[PDB]
Coordinates of C-alpha atoms and ligand atoms in Angstrom, one line a residue:
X1 CA -3.7 6.0 119.1
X2 CA -5.9 3.8 120.7
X3 CA -5.1 2.3 123.9
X4 CA -4.3 -1.6 123.6
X5 CA -1.7 -0.4 120.5
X6 CA 0.5 2.0 122.3
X7 CA 0.8 -0.5 125.0
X8 CA 1.8 -3.2 122.4
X9 CA 3.8 -0.8 121.1
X10 CA 5.5 -0.2 124.8
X11 CA 5.1 -4.1 124.7
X12 CA 8.4 -4.5 121.9
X13 CA 9.6 -0.8 122.3
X14 CA 10.8 -1.5 125.8
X15 CA 9.7 -5.0 126.9
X16 CA 11.5 -4.9 130.5
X17 CA 10.5 -1.3 131.8
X18 CA 7.8 -2.4 134.0
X19 CA 4.4 -1.5 133.3
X20 CA 2.7 -2.4 137.1
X21 CA 4.4 -2.6 140.7
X22 CA 1.9 -3.9 143.5
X23 CA 3.5 -5.5 146.3
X24 CA 6.6 -6.7 146.3
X25 CA 5.1 -8.5 142.5
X26 CA 6.0 -6.7 139.3
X27 CA 4.9 -6.7 135.4
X28 CA 6.9 -5.6 132.0
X29 CA 4.4 -4.6 129.2
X30 CA 6.1 -7.7 128.0
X31 CA 4.4 -9.8 130.0
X32 CA 1.4 -7.8 130.5
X33 CA 0.7 -7.9 126.8
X34 CA 2.1 -11.6 126.8
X35 CA -0.1 -12.7 129.9
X36 CA -3.1 -10.5 128.2
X37 CA -2.8 -12.2 124.9
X38 CA -3.0 -15.8 126.5
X39 CA -5.6 -14.3 128.8
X40 CA -8.2 -13.6 125.7
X41 CA -7.5 -16.7 124.1
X42 CA -8.3 -18.7 127.4
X43 CA -11.1 -17.0 127.5
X44 CA -13.0 -17.4 124.5
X45 CA -12.6 -21.5 125.3
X46 CA -15.2 -20.9 128.4
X47 CA -18.2 -18.4 127.3
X48 CA -19.6 -17.8 123.6
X49 CA -18.9 -14.5 121.9
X50 CA -22.4 -14.5 120.1
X51 CA -22.8 -11.6 122.0
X52 CA -20.5 -8.9 124.3
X53 CA -21.6 -10.5 128.2
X54 CA -19.3 -8.5 130.9
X55 CA -16.6 -10.6 132.8
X56 CA -16.3 -10.0 136.0
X57 CA -12.7 -9.5 137.6
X58 CA -12.7 -10.5 141.0
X59 CA -9.8 -9.4 143.0
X60 CA -7.9 -5.9 145.1
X61 CA -5.1 -4.5 143.3
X62 CA -2.7 -7.9 142.4
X63 CA -1.3 -8.2 139.0
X64 CA -3.7 -10.1 137.8
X65 CA -6.4 -8.0 137.8
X66 CA -4.9 -5.6 134.7
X67 CA -3.9 -8.9 133.3
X68 CA -7.7 -9.9 133.7
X69 CA -8.8 -6.6 132.0
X70 CA -6.3 -6.3 128.9
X71 CA -7.5 -10.8 128.2
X72 CA -11.3 -9.6 128.5
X73 CA -11.2 -6.4 125.9
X74 CA -8.6 -7.9 123.7
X75 CA -11.3 -11.1 123.9
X76 CA -13.9 -8.8 122.6
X77 CA -15.6 -9.1 126.2
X78 CA -16.1 -6.2 128.4
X79 CA -14.6 -5.9 132.3
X80 CA -16.7 -5.4 134.9
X81 CA -14.0 -4.9 138.0
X82 CA -15.1 -6.2 141.4
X83 CA -13.4 -5.3 144.7
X84 CA -12.7 -7.3 148.1
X85 CA -14.7 -5.1 149.1
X86 CA -18.0 -5.7 147.8
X87 CA -20.1 -8.5 149.1
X88 CA -21.1 -11.7 147.8
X89 CA -25.2 -10.1 147.6
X90 CA -23.9 -7.2 146.5
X91 CA -21.9 -9.3 143.8
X92 CA -25.0 -12.0 142.9
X93 CA -27.1 -8.6 142.4
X94 CA -23.9 -7.1 139.8
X95 CA -23.7 -10.7 138.4
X96 CA -27.4 -11.2 138.0
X97 CA -27.8 -7.7 135.8
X98 CA -24.9 -7.4 134.2
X99 CA -26.0 -10.9 132.3
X100 CA -21.7 -11.7 133.0
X101 CA -21.1 -15.4 132.5
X102 CA -17.3 -15.6 133.5
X103 CA -15.7 -14.4 137.3
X104 CA -12.0 -14.8 137.0
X105 CA -10.6 -14.0 140.7
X106 CA -7.0 -12.9 139.7
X107 CA -5.6 -15.5 142.9
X108 CA -6.7 -18.8 144.4
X109 CA -9.5 -18.5 146.8
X110 CA -10.0 -19.5 150.3
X111 CA -11.9 -20.8 153.5
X112 CA -15.0 -20.0 151.8
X113 CA -14.6 -17.7 149.1
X114 CA -16.1 -17.6 146.1
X115 CA -19.9 -19.0 145.9
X116 CA -21.3 -17.6 143.1
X117 CA -23.5 -19.1 140.1
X118 CA -21.8 -18.2 137.4
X119 CA -18.5 -19.5 135.7
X120 CA -14.9 -19.1 137.9
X121 CA -11.5 -19.4 137.1
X122 CA -8.4 -18.2 138.7
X123 CA -6.3 -15.7 136.7
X124 CA -3.3 -18.8 137.3
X125 CA -5.8 -21.5 135.8
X126 CA -6.6 -19.2 132.8
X127 CA -2.7 -18.5 132.4
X128 CA -1.9 -22.0 131.8
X129 CA -3.7 -21.7 127.9
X130 CA -1.4 -22.3 125.5
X131 CA -0.2 -20.6 122.1
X132 CA -3.1 -18.4 123.7
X133 CA -2.8 -15.1 120.9
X134 CA -6.1 -13.3 119.8
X135 CA -6.1 -10.6 116.9
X136 CA -6.6 -7.1 117.3
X137 CA -9.7 -7.7 115.0
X138 CA -10.9 -9.8 118.6
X139 CA -10.5 -6.6 121.0
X140 CA -13.5 -4.3 121.7
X141 CA -13.0 -1.1 119.5
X142 CA -14.9 2.5 119.2
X143 CA -18.3 2.1 120.9
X144 CA -18.3 -1.1 122.1
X145 CA -18.0 -1.4 125.9
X146 CA -14.7 -1.5 127.5
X147 CA -15.3 -2.0 130.9
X148 CA -18.9 -1.2 132.9
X149 CA -18.5 0.3 136.7
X150 CA -21.2 -0.7 139.3
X151 CA -22.4 2.4 140.9
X152 CA -25.2 3.1 144.2
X153 CA -28.8 2.9 142.7
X154 CA -30.8 4.9 144.6
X155 CA -34.0 2.0 144.4
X156 CA -31.8 -0.1 146.4
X157 CA -29.6 -2.2 143.6
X158 CA -26.3 -1.3 142.0
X159 CA -26.4 0.1 138.7
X160 CA -23.9 -0.2 135.9
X161 CA -22.3 2.4 133.9
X162 CA -21.0 1.2 130.5
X163 CA -17.8 2.8 129.1
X164 CA -17.1 2.1 125.6
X165 CA -13.7 2.3 124.7
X166 CA -14.2 6.0 122.7
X167 CA -15.2 6.8 126.0
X168 CA -12.5 6.0 127.5
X169 CA -10.0 6.5 124.9
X170 CA -11.8 10.2 124.6
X171 CA -10.6 10.5 128.7
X172 CA -6.8 8.8 128.3
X173 CA -6.1 11.2 125.4
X174 CA -6.6 14.0 127.3
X175 CA -5.0 13.4 130.7
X176 CA -1.8 12.1 128.5
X177 CA -2.0 15.3 126.0
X178 CA -2.8 18.1 128.4
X179 CA -1.1 17.3 132.1
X180 CA 2.7 16.2 133.0
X181 CA 2.0 12.4 133.3
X182 CA 4.1 11.8 130.1
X183 CA 7.7 10.7 129.6
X184 CA 7.2 7.3 131.1
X185 CA 6.8 8.3 135.2
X186 CA 5.5 6.4 137.8
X187 CA 1.7 6.6 139.0
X188 CA 0.2 5.9 142.1
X189 CA -2.6 3.5 142.2
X190 CA -4.2 3.5 145.5
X191 CA -8.3 4.1 144.5
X192 CA -9.4 0.0 144.2
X193 CA -10.3 -0.9 140.7
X194 CA -14.1 -1.0 141.0
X195 CA -13.9 2.6 141.2
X196 CA -13.5 4.9 138.2
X197 CA -11.2 7.0 139.9
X198 CA -8.8 4.7 139.3
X199 CA -8.6 5.0 135.3
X200 CA -7.6 8.1 136.3
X201 CA -4.0 6.6 137.1
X202 CA -4.1 3.3 135.1
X203 CA -4.9 3.7 131.8
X204 CA -2.9 7.1 131.1
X205 CA 0.2 5.6 132.9
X206 CA 0.1 2.4 130.2
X207 CA -0.8 4.1 127.3
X208 CA 2.3 6.9 128.2
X209 CA 4.4 4.0 129.1
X210 CA 4.8 4.7 132.4
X211 CA 5.2 2.5 135.4
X212 CA 2.2 2.0 138.0
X213 CA 2.5 1.3 141.4
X214 CA -0.1 0.3 143.5
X215 CA -0.3 1.0 147.7
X216 CA -3.4 -1.6 149.0
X217 CA -5.9 -1.7 151.1
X218 CA -3.4 -3.5 153.9
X219 CA -0.4 -0.8 153.0
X220 CA -3.3 1.6 154.1
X221 CA -4.5 0.0 157.8
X222 CA -0.9 0.4 159.0
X223 CA 0.5 3.6 158.2
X224 CA 4.0 3.5 159.2
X225 CA 4.2 0.8 156.1
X226 CA 2.2 3.0 154.4
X227 CA 4.4 5.8 154.3
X228 CA 7.4 2.7 154.0
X229 CA 6.4 2.0 150.4
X230 CA 5.7 5.1 149.1
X231 CA 9.1 6.3 150.1
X232 CA 10.9 3.6 147.9
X233 CA 8.3 4.0 145.2
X234 CA 9.8 7.4 143.7
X235 CA 6.1 8.2 142.5
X236 CA 5.8 10.9 140.3
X237 CA 2.5 11.3 139.5
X238 CA -0.3 11.0 142.7
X239 CA -3.4 9.9 141.4
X240 CA -6.6 9.7 144.5
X241 CA -9.2 11.0 146.2
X242 CA -8.7 14.6 148.3
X243 CA -9.7 12.7 151.6
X244 CA -6.7 9.9 151.0
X245 CA -4.0 13.0 150.4
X246 CA -5.8 14.5 153.6
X247 CA -5.2 11.4 156.4
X248 CA -1.8 11.9 154.4
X249 CA -0.9 15.1 155.3
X250 CA -2.2 14.6 158.8
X251 CA 0.9 13.0 159.6
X252 CA 4.4 15.7 159.2
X253 CA 6.5 13.5 157.9
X254 CA 4.3 13.6 154.3
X255 CA 6.2 16.0 152.8
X256 CA 8.4 16.5 149.6
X257 CA 11.0 14.4 151.8
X258 CA 8.6 12.0 152.1
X259 CA 8.4 11.9 147.6
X260 CA 11.2 13.7 146.3
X261 CA 10.4 12.6 143.5
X262 CA 6.4 13.7 143.5
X263 CA 5.6 16.5 140.5
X264 CA 2.3 15.5 140.1
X265 CA -0.6 16.0 142.1
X266 CA -3.9 14.4 140.6
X267 CA -7.5 14.9 142.4
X268 CA -10.9 13.9 141.8
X269 CA -13.8 12.8 143.1
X270 CA -14.7 15.1 145.5
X271 CA -15.0 17.9 147.0
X272 CA -10.8 19.2 147.0
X273 CA -10.5 21.1 149.9
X274 CA -8.8 24.8 150.0
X275 CA -6.7 23.6 152.9
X276 CA -5.6 20.3 151.6
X277 CA -4.6 22.5 148.7
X278 CA -2.4 25.4 150.6
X279 CA -0.6 22.3 152.3
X280 CA 0.3 20.6 149.0
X281 CA 1.9 23.6 148.2
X282 CA 3.8 24.2 151.3
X283 CA 5.0 20.7 151.6
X284 CA 5.4 19.6 147.6
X285 CA 7.1 22.6 146.0
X286 CA 8.4 20.6 143.3
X287 CA 4.9 19.5 142.2
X288 CA 1.9 21.0 140.9
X289 CA -1.9 20.2 141.8
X290 CA -5.0 19.9 139.2
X291 CA -8.8 19.7 140.4
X292 CA -10.7 17.1 137.7
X293 CA -14.5 16.9 138.7
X294 CA -17.1 14.5 136.6
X295 CA -19.3 11.8 137.4
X296 CA -18.1 7.7 136.5
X297 CA -21.6 8.1 133.9
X298 CA -19.1 10.4 132.0
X299 CA -15.8 8.7 132.2
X300 CA -14.1 9.8 135.3
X301 CA -13.4 13.6 134.9
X302 CA -14.8 16.0 132.4
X303 CA -13.3 19.3 133.3
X304 CA -9.4 20.5 135.3
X305 CA -7.5 23.7 137.1
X306 CA -4.2 23.7 137.6
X307 CA -4.5 24.8 141.6
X308 CA -2.0 27.7 142.5
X309 CA -2.3 30.2 145.4
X310 CA -3.2 32.7 142.9
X311 CA -6.4 30.4 142.1
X312 CA -6.8 29.9 146.0
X313 CA -6.7 33.8 146.8
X314 CA -9.3 34.2 143.9
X315 CA -12.1 32.4 146.1
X316 CA -12.7 31.1 148.8
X317 CA -14.1 27.7 147.3
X318 CA -12.0 26.1 144.5
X319 CA -13.4 25.5 141.3
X320 CA -13.5 22.3 139.7
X321 CA -12.3 23.5 135.8
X322 CA -12.4 24.0 132.8
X323 CA -14.1 22.0 130.1
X324 CA -12.3 19.0 128.8
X325 CA -11.3 20.4 125.4
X326 CA -14.2 18.7 123.1
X327 CA -16.7 18.5 126.1
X328 CA -19.5 21.1 126.7
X329 CA -20.6 21.5 130.0
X330 CA -23.8 23.6 130.6
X331 CA -25.8 25.2 133.9
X332 CA -29.4 23.8 132.6
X333 CA -32.2 24.8 134.8
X334 CA -34.9 23.2 136.7
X335 CA -37.4 23.9 133.7
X336 CA -34.7 22.2 131.1
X337 CA -32.8 25.2 129.4
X338 CA -29.5 26.7 130.2
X339 CA -28.3 29.6 132.3
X340 CA -26.1 32.9 131.4
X341 CA -23.1 32.5 133.9
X342 CA -23.5 33.1 137.9
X343 CA -27.0 31.8 137.7
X344 CA -27.4 28.2 139.9
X345 CA -28.7 25.4 137.8
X346 CA -27.7 21.8 137.5
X347 CA -24.5 20.7 135.6
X348 CA -24.8 19.1 132.5
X349 CA -22.0 17.3 130.3
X350 CA -22.4 16.3 126.8
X351 CA -20.1 15.0 124.5
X352 CA -17.6 12.1 123.4
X353 CA -16.6 11.5 127.4
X354 CA -20.7 10.9 128.3
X355 CA -21.7 6.4 128.5
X356 CA -24.7 5.4 126.8
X357 CA -25.7 4.8 129.8
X358 CA -27.1 2.2 132.1
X359 CA -26.8 -1.6 131.5
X360 CA -30.4 -3.5 131.4
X361 CA -31.5 -0.5 133.3
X362 CA -33.4 1.9 129.9
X363 CA -35.8 3.5 132.5
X364 CA -33.3 4.5 134.5
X365 CA -31.1 5.8 131.8
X366 CA -34.0 7.4 130.1
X367 CA -33.9 10.2 133.2
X368 CA -30.7 10.9 133.3
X369 CA -29.0 10.8 129.9
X370 CA -31.0 12.9 127.1
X371 CA -29.9 13.6 123.1
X372 CA -28.8 17.3 123.3
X373 CA -28.1 19.8 120.1
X374 CA -27.4 15.9 118.6
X375 CA -25.2 15.0 121.1
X376 CA -25.6 12.5 123.8
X377 CA -25.8 13.9 127.4
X378 CA -26.0 13.1 131.2
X379 CA -27.5 15.4 133.8
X380 CA -24.9 15.0 136.6
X381 CA -27.3 16.0 139.3
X382 CA -24.5 18.5 140.7
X383 CA -25.6 22.1 141.1
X384 CA -23.1 24.7 139.8
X385 CA -22.7 27.7 137.8
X386 CA -20.0 28.7 135.3
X387 CA -17.5 32.0 136.8
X388 CA -15.4 33.3 134.0
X389 CA -15.3 30.0 132.0
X390 CA -15.0 27.7 134.8
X391 CA -17.4 26.1 136.3
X392 CA -17.5 25.7 140.1
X393 CA -19.5 23.0 141.9
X394 CA -21.6 23.4 145.3
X395 CA -24.0 20.1 146.4
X396 CA -26.8 18.3 145.5
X397 CA -30.8 18.4 143.9
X398 CA -31.3 14.7 145.2
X399 CA -30.0 12.0 147.9
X400 CA -26.4 11.1 146.7
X401 CA -24.2 12.1 148.7
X402 CA -20.3 11.5 148.8
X403 CA -18.6 9.7 152.4
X404 CA -14.9 10.2 152.4
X405 CA -15.1 10.4 148.6
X406 CA -17.4 7.3 148.7
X407 CA -20.5 7.4 146.5
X408 CA -23.6 6.6 147.8
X409 CA -26.9 6.7 147.5
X410 CA -29.0 7.3 151.1
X411 CA -31.8 5.9 149.5
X412 CA -30.3 2.6 148.4
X413 CA -29.4 2.5 152.3
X414 CA -33.1 3.2 153.4
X415 CA -33.9 0.5 150.9
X416 CA -31.6 -1.9 152.6
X417 CA -32.2 -1.0 156.2
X418 CA -35.9 -1.4 155.6
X419 CA -36.0 -4.1 153.9
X420 CA -35.4 -6.0 157.1
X421 CA -37.4 -8.6 159.1
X422 CA -36.6 -5.6 162.7
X423 CA -37.0 -3.0 160.8
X424 CA -40.5 -0.9 159.4
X425 CA -39.1 2.2 158.6
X426 CA -35.6 4.0 157.9
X427 CA -34.6 7.3 157.3
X428 CA -30.3 7.8 157.0
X429 CA -28.8 11.0 158.1
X430 CA -25.7 12.1 157.2
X431 CA -23.9 13.9 159.6
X432 CA -22.5 16.9 157.6
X433 CA -21.7 19.8 160.2
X434 CA -19.4 22.0 158.0
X435 CA -20.4 20.5 154.5
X436 CA -18.2 17.4 154.1
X437 CA -20.0 14.0 155.8
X438 CA -18.2 12.7 158.2
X439 CA -20.6 9.7 159.3
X440 CA -24.5 8.3 158.7
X441 CA -27.4 7.9 161.1
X442 CA -29.8 5.6 160.9
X443 CA -33.1 6.7 161.9
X444 CA -35.4 3.1 162.7
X445 CA -38.7 2.5 163.4
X446 CA -38.5 -1.1 164.5
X447 CA -40.6 -4.0 164.1
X448 CA -41.4 -6.2 167.5
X449 CA -39.0 -8.6 167.8
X450 CA -37.5 -10.7 171.0
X451 CA -34.1 -8.9 171.4
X452 CA -32.4 -7.9 174.8
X453 CA -30.3 -5.4 174.6
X454 CA -30.3 -2.4 171.9
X455 CA -26.8 -3.4 170.2
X456 CA -28.4 -6.8 170.1
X457 CA -31.7 -5.4 167.2
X458 CA -28.3 -3.3 166.4
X459 CA -26.4 -5.8 165.2
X460 CA -28.8 -8.3 163.8
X461 CA -29.2 -5.7 161.3
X462 CA -26.0 -4.5 160.5
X463 CA -24.5 -7.9 160.2
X464 CA -27.8 -8.3 157.5
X465 CA -26.7 -4.9 155.0
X466 CA -22.9 -6.2 155.6
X467 CA -23.6 -8.7 153.2
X468 CA -25.2 -6.3 150.7
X469 CA -23.6 -2.9 151.2
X470 CA -19.9 -2.1 151.1
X471 CA -18.5 -1.2 154.6
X472 CA -18.4 2.1 154.0
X473 CA -22.6 2.2 153.7
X474 CA -23.1 0.9 156.6
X475 CA -24.0 3.6 158.8
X476 CA -22.7 4.5 162.2
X477 CA -24.9 5.2 164.7
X478 CA -28.4 3.4 164.8
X479 CA -31.1 5.1 167.1
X480 CA -34.8 3.7 167.2
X481 CA -37.9 5.9 167.8
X482 CA -41.9 5.2 167.2
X483 CA -42.5 6.7 163.4
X484 CA -41.2 9.2 161.4
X485 CA -42.4 12.7 160.3
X486 CA -43.3 12.0 156.6
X487 CA -44.3 15.5 155.0
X488 CA -45.6 16.7 151.5
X489 CA -48.5 13.8 151.6
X490 CA -45.9 10.7 152.7
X491 CA -42.3 12.4 151.6
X492 CA -40.3 12.5 155.0
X493 CA -39.1 15.7 156.6
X494 CA -35.1 14.7 156.8
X495 CA -34.2 18.1 158.3
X496 CA -36.8 17.4 161.5
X497 CA -35.6 14.0 162.1
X498 CA -31.8 15.0 161.8
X499 CA -32.4 17.9 164.5
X500 CA -34.1 15.4 166.9
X501 CA -31.2 12.6 166.6
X502 CA -28.5 15.6 166.9
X503 CA -30.7 16.2 170.1
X504 CA -30.1 12.8 171.5
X505 CA -26.4 12.9 170.7
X506 CA -26.6 15.0 173.7
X507 CA -28.7 12.9 176.1
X508 CA -25.9 10.6 177.4
Ligands
AMP1 N1 -13.6 17.6 141.6 C1 -14.8 17.7 142.2 N2 -14.9 18.6 143.2 C2 -16.3 18.5 143.8 N3 -16.6 17.8 144.0 C3 -16.9 16.4 142.6 C4 -15.7 16.9 142.1 N4 -15.3 15.9 141.1 C5 -16.8 14.9 142.0 N5 -17.4 15.3 142.5 C6 -18.6 15.4 143.3 O1 -17.9 13.4 143.0 C7 -19.8 12.9 142.3 C8 -19.1 12.0 141.1 O2 -19.2 10.8 142.0 P1 -18.2 9.4 141.5 O3 -19.2 8.8 140.2 O4 -17.9 8.5 142.7 O5 -16.8 9.8 140.7 C9 -19.8 14.3 141.1 O6 -20.8 14.3 140.8 C10 -19.6 15.2 142.8 O7 -21.2 15.7 143.0

């Protein structure tokens, strides 16, 4: 059952049951469906249906975000979710490449808020449309793009992964059918909508007729209310990055007691530490844990495996799971061909979950996406192997990293740092003693300026980055040098620069 129809049916069958809860505000499947209907209609009066141009949906987790998502697709346009944490210049970059002709801000802005060169509408303004009613024939369908989520681009600009209705539905049916989330449960949502991890709970929840319970950035920044918010939620399904639950597990009060109704843990987006898995099993004895791996380029995740003490003892490195029933995953080699179980190669995903490609970026698509055996496939860039039928994920082949579950390209950061007038050269070092990156270091070969102190030159640069890079991509540490070790007749030697930098960290 197409996603939109299930939501439509829940709006008709049980129009009074909540579909979305976010900071005191609520929304029923009836309200969600009628408002989204109104939005779709108001949208078609502001942009041409000539082409399926993206519509940026701006905000955090207010009810209008979910309404606009549905309004966009019901109107036949894919939406680009944009979180408040994404800075002006990046947004401008996204607007630029996506060809978007409409940005909806879930609420009236503030003192110096929206300042973009694209049609702007508050969600409230749109919702003042009248009859506002599109017909099913308008809704995006089949291989038409449902949403485009942008992610870090190694060349310096973000790239938009296009996810079709078929992509999404394929993933959604998977979750609802193969996992204990059906029955109209309460799904937690901690991930901002601009990261597809959010999709793992958002759409499987709406299709299953459950209730989405958001936990905003605000609550997260206040440990007291965070837990307060959680206890009152009565959530059943917990979906988040391992890092987030690990921060919560940092408190003793976080256990079955806090979330008496918690029965399902959905993790994805980064390595799920064995320890974090053990604790969960101890503190939440009434809930099962699930581990799923996958890149944004393949619609959230394409594998899964229930974590049990039996699965924990059998390996000192938790597996990512077995392939999505309709997905094929291979372990290609440096040459481009397959590999037998046990060998270490690059994980390759082929199947209905794979994206058609990066928006407006053919050369980039061309390198990562390809037709294999007749089915669209994607080179994940991850290194792994398959043992006993289950994929094991270990490290990347390139310079893309994960910081606290945040995906970023070390080369996009270096690009921006080097794009400064004050900078002549730059290399970003991920401090990852164990394996998990704790923070980033920026080794910089400066340009003769006129500043006084160092946090002077360091502040001017960061202030710049703050404009084009989300906060989690701004290096924590800045150290300066005279020149960089460019090995391989040019390719700098990252390993050595790191060593030097850690040594310098000992000299106060
Ligand atoms: N379950 C997992 N275990 C280990 N690493 C993962 C897992 N899921 C995702 N990843 C990593 O995160 C990447 C996808 O990042 P993202 O597109 O931001 O969701 C994967 O290619 C891996 O590098």
